[PDB]
Design a protein around this nucleic acid. Structure first.
Ligand SMILES: [Cl-]
Ligand SMILES: [Cl-]
Ligand SMILES: [Cl-]
Ligand SMILES: [Cl-]
Ligand SMILES: [Mg+2]
Ligand SMILES: [Mg+2]
Ligand SMILES: [Mg+2]
Ligand SMILES: [Mg+2]
Ligand SMILES: [Mg+2]
Ligand SMILES: [Mg+2]
Ligand SMILES: [Mg+2]
Ligand SMILES: [Mg+2]
Ligand SMILES: [Mg+2]
Ligand SMILES: [Mg+2]
Ligand SMILES: [Mg+2]
Ligand SMILES: [Mg+2]
Ligand SMILES: [Mg+2]
Ligand SMILES: [Mg+2]
Ligand SMILES: [Mg+2]
Ligand SMILES: [Mg+2]
Ligand SMILES: [Mg+2]
Ligand SMILES: [Mg+2]
Ligand SMILES: [Mg+2]
Ligand SMILES: [Mg+2]
Ligand SMILES: [Mg+2]
Ligand SMILES: [Mg+2]
Ligand SMILES: [Mg+2]
Ligand SMILES: [Mg+2]
Ligand SMILES: [Mg+2]
Ligand SMILES: [Mg+2]
Ligand SMILES: [Mg+2]
Ligand SMILES: [Mg+2]
Ligand SMILES: [Mg+2]
Ligand SMILES: [Mg+2]
Ligand SMILES: [Mg+2]
Ligand SMILES: [Mg+2]
Ligand SMILES: [Mg+2]
Ligand SMILES: [Mg+2]
Ligand SMILES: [Mg+2]
Ligand SMILES: [Mg+2]
Ligand SMILES: [Mg+2]
Ligand SMILES: [Mg+2]
Lengths: 159, 51, 146, 148, 56, 185, 49
RNA sequence: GUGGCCUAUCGAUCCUUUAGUCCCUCGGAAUUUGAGGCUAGAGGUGCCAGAAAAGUUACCACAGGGAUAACUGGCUUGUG
RNA sequence: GCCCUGAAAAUGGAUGGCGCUCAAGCGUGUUACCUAUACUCUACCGUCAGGGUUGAUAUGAUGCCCUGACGAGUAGGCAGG
RNA sequence: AAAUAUGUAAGAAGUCCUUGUUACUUAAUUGAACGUGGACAUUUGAAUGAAGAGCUUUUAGUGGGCCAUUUUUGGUAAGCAGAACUGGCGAUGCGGGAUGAACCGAACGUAGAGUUAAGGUGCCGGAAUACACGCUCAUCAGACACCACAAAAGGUGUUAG
RNA sequence: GGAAUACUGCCAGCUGGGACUGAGGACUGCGACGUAAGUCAAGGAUGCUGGCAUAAUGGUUAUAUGCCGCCCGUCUUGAAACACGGACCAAGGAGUCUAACGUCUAUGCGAGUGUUUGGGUGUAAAACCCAUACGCGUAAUGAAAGUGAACGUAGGUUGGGGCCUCGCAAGAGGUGCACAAUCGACCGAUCCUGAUGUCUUCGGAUGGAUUUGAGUAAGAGCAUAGCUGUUGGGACCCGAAAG
RNA sequence: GAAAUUGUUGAAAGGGAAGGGCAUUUGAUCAGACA
């Protein structure tokens, strides 16, 4: 018959990285997590307690609860034609701070700095990111860079 | 009640774009270009004809 | 590709719209390449498209642009008050290109008068077909369809 | 009336709205409450939890008249006084002129205290009363007389 | 007679007729599963700050 | 061919007229149709839509609810507007001297308002006095208090009322409602 | 046989119930009969009440 | 540290029985037995969301099925 | 590359047929031309949406009118007749 | 260690300055959580679009499917059996493939005019027995995707290398 | 060294021939040409002219010619099928009624609602009138004994139509019903704490608990009617082998 | 005194079915306006 156990099909997912076995470094346990923080889930195979299910591998959520050695995380899961809220109790070994928004904080700080700098004299501070734009015109000099002619080469075996 | 196409109905072409009358009177559609005399450098010509 | 065509307001054959060229829109054109023909329009092509087949979206309705008043009443807050102002905003992609371009209803073109010039359309323009980027050659095709 | 039913609209449509594949047969799935634990379990576990089994203790020869005790709250206590006489009693809140309200004659067994009554003394006669109801009546200057 | 066993054909198209709804986000989410010791003190903290604002 | 993004020929889904055949109700609709068209006042638009509502969408508003709304800071001299029926409430022993405009007044509700010095007027009288809804206050009754609502969304762990005829010890309190009998909900 | 969210019904019609259906078509007729009977009884019993 | 390093090692209603609470009821009023309830387990359904169940018909019956076998034909050609 | 040998099935027979050999065959290039219920413009029918109009002395404010878009369909649903 | 798919973020429910509550927490007014007051408006925090968005009740039919491209399992193979994503048929006419449920083009209110798609223009049959450079002669030539089959090995046939 | 031409593109350059269409129905708009008056191809056709006034146009019908068109109904992935029913015509021929209910809608009254078991009355199975009860609703929660819904403007916070103030407007502030989310308070059940007092075992005040309820928190229901849906009934119509 | 079905008379068509759709010719037949 078929087999659909809890850790089914996780042969490679939960393995340790090459030459990275053994105990966890202490910086994992020294980080602080607060309600509202954004974390991403990556299970560690050497810690069998408080381990997430394989579905949540590589997912990102928001902390809603803090306990002695674990945190509570909220994940939106697509079931059928809708999304359901899932709450996970995970030990800190299996999570880390997400940088998908930590990089966004500095853009907020820089926007305030640029707004205040131009507040006294400037208008239209233009605090909006823009996509890559088409290149403008330029002049290409041939001084010391005379074009080299190329031609297709004949077929050769050289086996 | 009936869309009339400018560039074939002159009155409609004048209702919009009053500059059309000035454009036609001065023949701005056949404006002569000022003559120049710049010539390509020897490197440009020898590269164009190079094998 | 079906979703991208809807986001570009191309919902029927021989429909046309203007697109501002950025990194975010170049990737969109790649997805719908075997379904469209596009290129770089000239001033003459833009002028004739707006004059003959230019309609404005006013209160979710398609209204012909037969008088400068209706343009001013809908785009006057952006400084556009005539049909030539609208054309100027299109050919020179200005600060209010998005508002001016979205104001224009998607163009409804016919089949080309002289034909497509190829026996089979649904190949790339480079391989003797019709779809893809044909650069300045789009002007000859559009004027045949206008 | 028959002229407004969908049977009239179905005339000339072969299947009469029942479908060509499934059809309209006699009793697919059984009759009545058949299969409540076998093939209708899902519809019984939801929409009807608690259907199967027994809970309490039996009572042979129940008589509902033994348990007759309609409840009346304090917020509707003054409705037992006729409207023409309510106003004078409210404006004349004092002792030795307190109206007598016999809740049993109005068909009530127990007086519960939910709302708030005006600060007017009143004599309330009842078979049963809750602890809170008596306190509010005495707080307004009234008394509760037990009857049988 | 043998029949088909399983397929996911047409299932995604059915799900996109009205589906793929992002969950509605609310201010003040439910505190289900929050640590009971934190919630016991948070209740007392809210009562204290309610009196101060009312009596201000 | 057109690759449609939305369903074609879709009705708006909102009522544009009363379902009733009441001749007097249609006159009120005609009156406020004119006012909503040529007054550009948001009050008239709200009233016109309210006249189209069905019975369950116009729950009754009691006098006690009216009296509480008149205790709002600065609302003691406003005209209460109820598009529906105003009912009497004997749980309250004091009533203000307000003016109330409503479609219908019960016999008890009218007597209580009048004996307090107030007046009861119809919606056409209100339009004469306040053609743009000056100094008005619209009150609506509770919709989810209806008995039918408590059965909606029935299911496990939902806490809704089951649809049942007889209520008692032997009616849907066994297996499925307690841990001693299989499981609870 | 069991579908949708509906109350459990107990309609006791599994016997030959159609053979024992009583419709009171004579409700108005019996009222006339009782009134006639009371009138003729009053005349029979003299001025008795 | 709330069993086995992790991923399997298992079971409703009715009934019986045990533990707990010594609490509620036996409806004319009481005492004592007995019985019935409340909370938590056990006795088992392996067809494992859980009817209590041996054959034969070459004497045969009915409702159906080309959703399905015993001939041709069609696809295939291992085998010949 | 093209052609030929290798290349044997049972009623009479099918590049669709006739027929075609610097093709009406094969590979490739350039133009003109033919025609779908598709595209463009116009009229008419209906549907949906957004609006205008109670002021008597003339009849339908569920009336009249302005504007835009849309139209395949078994099982099945609803609406007007 | 890809490609294609896949999670989250791109602001007002946000950021910052000051200081109120608690029975939680800290050696400690330490922290945590929730608040009072002040400062910052929609180039307010990328692109494009948005026949409006959100929400509730109720009920029909259906629960035998099948086909095509790509990925793919069993089997010598099958117009065989079984999965993955998408598009179709079923439920659908119309132009093309002579003919065909699924291929190509294109989806349908009633009409007029114009222009095209796929496919075609010796005759049947509407449209060049058009133009241009070559190749091929078969006593079983060849002739257009899905598609209605042909191989290994050979020829001083002829052509180019 | 000076031109020409080809190719590609542009013109708010001019002009000839052909086909289809004429929707609207006083005026109103935007423009053009003009010193002016006025005119115009400027928000949809007018002017002139001929023949005939009837089977001439046209309709209907039969036939002929070009192209096209397989037999309907049914089950099915697939029917013109070498799958089944059907020789022809007339008349008859299949989702009904009832008891109890869900959603929705209309109507009356409304913290109530229901006259019709029955009585009164009558122009007599109608219409009209009426007492007392009873049903449902207005209190829930426990197996039961039993107990029983306001600390507070019937709470706080966030979002809210409308209204109010100021403002030309944009906006700002105030008040905020319904409804949505959340934290509290209240009533019953469960598990704890056990005051004043005692038939010394009764009494259960007071204060708590990641527990629990189809609850409270200025009521909404009752009755009649209709489409649709549910169950029992012959139950959409016709059909067994049996007992 | 209907239909299936049948006789007579009149008209029309018919080279291995008949019937149908679009368009027009021919024959027969017919309403409308002559303001
Ligand atoms: Cl219908
Ligand atoms: Cl499938
Ligand atoms: Cl013919
Ligand atoms: Cl209890
Ligand atoms: Mg373990
Ligand atoms: Mg041509
Ligand atoms: Mg072609
Ligand atoms: Mg149908
Ligand atoms: Mg059938
Ligand atoms: Mg069925
Ligand atoms: Mg049936
Ligand atoms: Mg079973
Ligand atoms: Mg199946
Ligand atoms: Mg061990
Ligand atoms: Mg006894
Ligand atoms: Mg099973
Ligand atoms: Mg068994
Ligand atoms: Mg078969
Ligand atoms: Mg062999
Ligand atoms: Mg060729
Ligand atoms: Mg067409
Ligand atoms: Mg269409
Ligand atoms: Mg249709
Ligand atoms: Mg089936
Ligand atoms: Mg098969
Ligand atoms: Mg089918
Ligand atoms: Mg073929
Ligand atoms: Mg020809
Ligand atoms: Mg004629
Ligand atoms: Mg013919
Ligand atoms: Mg022919
Ligand atoms: Mg044919
Ligand atoms: Mg079959
Ligand atoms: Mg058939
Ligand atoms: Mg059969
Ligand atoms: Mg037969
Ligand atoms: Mg008949
Ligand atoms: Mg019949
Ligand atoms: Mg019926
Ligand atoms: Mg038997
Ligand atoms: Mg006769
Ligand atoms: Mg006959």
């Amino acid at each position: 018959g078929k087999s659909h156990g809890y850790r089914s099909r996780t042969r490679y997912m939960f393995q340790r990285d090459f030459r990275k076995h053994g105990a966890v470094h202490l910086s994992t346990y020294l980080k602080v997590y607060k309600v509202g923080d954004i974390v991403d889930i990556k299970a560690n195979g050497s810690i069998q307690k408080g381990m997430p299910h394989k579905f949540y591998q590589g997912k990102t959520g928001v902390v809603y609860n803090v306990t002695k050695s674990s945190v509570g995380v909220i994940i939106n899961k697509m079931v059928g034609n809708r999304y359901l809220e899932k709450r996970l109790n995970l030990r800190v070994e299996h999570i880390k701070h997400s940088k998908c928004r930590q990089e966004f904080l500095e853009r907020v700080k820089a926007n305030a700095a640029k707004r205040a700098e131009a507040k006294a004299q400037g208008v239209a501070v233009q605090l909006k990111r823009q996509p890559a734009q088409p290149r403008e015109s330029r002049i290409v000099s041939t001084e010391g860079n005379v074009p080299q002619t190329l031609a297709p080469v004949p077929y050769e075996t050289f086996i | 009640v009936l869309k009339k196409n400018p560039l074939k109905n002159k009155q409609v072409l004048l209702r919009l774009n009053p500059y059309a009358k000035v454009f036609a009177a001065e023949k701005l559609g056949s404006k002569k270009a000022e003559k120049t005399g710049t010539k390509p450098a020897a490197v440009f010509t020898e590269t164009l004809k190079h094998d | 590709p079906r979703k991208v065509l809807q986001l570009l307001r191309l919902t029927r054959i021989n429909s046309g719209t203007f697109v501002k060229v950025t990194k975010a829109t170049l990737e969109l054109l790649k997805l719908i390449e075997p379904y469209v023909a596009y290129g770089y329009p000239s001033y003459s092509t833009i002028r004739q498209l707006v004059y003959k087949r230019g309609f404005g979206k006013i209160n979710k309705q398609r209204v012909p642009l037969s008088d400068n008043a209706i343009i001013e009443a809908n785009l006057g807050k952006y400084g556009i008050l005539s049909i030539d102002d609208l054309i100027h905003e299109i050919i020179t992609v200005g600060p209010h290109f998005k508002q001016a371009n979205n104001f224009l209803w998607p163009f409804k073109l016919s089949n080309p008068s002289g034909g497509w010039g190829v026996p089979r359309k649904f190949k790339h323009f480079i391989q003797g077909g019709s779809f893809g980027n044909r650069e300045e050659f789009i002007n000859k095709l559009v004027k045949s369809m206008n | 009336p028959s002229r407004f039913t969908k049977t009239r609209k179905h005339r000339g449509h072969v299947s009469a709205g029942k479908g060509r594949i499934g059809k309209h047969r006699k009793h697919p799935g059984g009759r009545g409450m058949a299969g409540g634990q076998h093939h209708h379990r899902i519809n019984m576990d939801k929409y009807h939890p608690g259907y199967f089994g027994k809970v309490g203790m039996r009572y042979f020869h129940k008589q509902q008249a033994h348990f007759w005790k309609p409840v009346l709250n304090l917020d509707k206590l003054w409705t037992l006084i006729p409207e023409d006489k309510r106003d004078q009693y409210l404006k004349s809140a004092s002792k030795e002129t307190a109206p007598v309200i016999d809740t049993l004659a109005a068909g009530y067994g127990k007086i519960l205290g939910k709302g708030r009554i005006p600060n007017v003394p009143v004599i309330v006669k009842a078979r049963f009363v809750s602890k809170l109801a008596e306190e509010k009546i005495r707080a307004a200057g009234g008394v509760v007389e037990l009857i049988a | 007679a043998k029949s088909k066993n399983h397929t996911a054909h047409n299932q995604t198209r059915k799900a996109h007729r009205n589906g793929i709804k992002k969950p509605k986000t609310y201010k003040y989410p439910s505190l289900k599963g929050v640590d009971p010791k934190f919630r016991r003190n948070h209740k007392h903290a809210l009562h204290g700050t309610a009196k101060a604002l009312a009596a201000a | 061919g057109i690759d449609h993004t939305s369903k074609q020929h879709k009705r708006s889904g909102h009522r544009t007229a009363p379902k009733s055949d009441n001749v007097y109700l249609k006159l009120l609709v005609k009156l406020y149709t004119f006012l909503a068209r040529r007054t550009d006042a948001p009050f008239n638009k709200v009233v016109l839509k309210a006249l189209f509502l069905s019975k369950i969408n116009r729950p009754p508003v009691s006098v006690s609810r009216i009296a509480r709304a008149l205790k709002q800071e600065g609302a003691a001299n406003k005209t209460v507007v109820v598009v529906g029926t105003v009912t009497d409430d004997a749980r309250i022993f004091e009533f203000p001297k307000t003016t109330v405009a409503a479609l219908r007044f019960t016999a008890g509700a009218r007597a209580k308002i009048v004996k307090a010095g107030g007046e009861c007027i119809t919606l056409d009288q209100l339009a004469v006095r306040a053609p743009k809804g000056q100094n008005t206050l619209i009150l609506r009754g509770p919709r989810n208090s209806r008995e039918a609502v408590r059965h909606f969304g029935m299911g496990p762990h939902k806490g809704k009322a089951p649809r049942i005829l007889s209520t008692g010890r032997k009616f849907e309190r066994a297996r499925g409602r307690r841990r001693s009998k299989g499981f609870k909900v | 046989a069991i579908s949708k969210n509906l109350p459990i019904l107990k309609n006791h019609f599994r016997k030959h119930w159609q053979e024992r259906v009583k419709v009171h078509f004579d409700q108005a007729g019996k009222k006339v009969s009782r009134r006639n009977a009371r009138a003729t009884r009053a005349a029979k019993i003299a001025p008795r009440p």
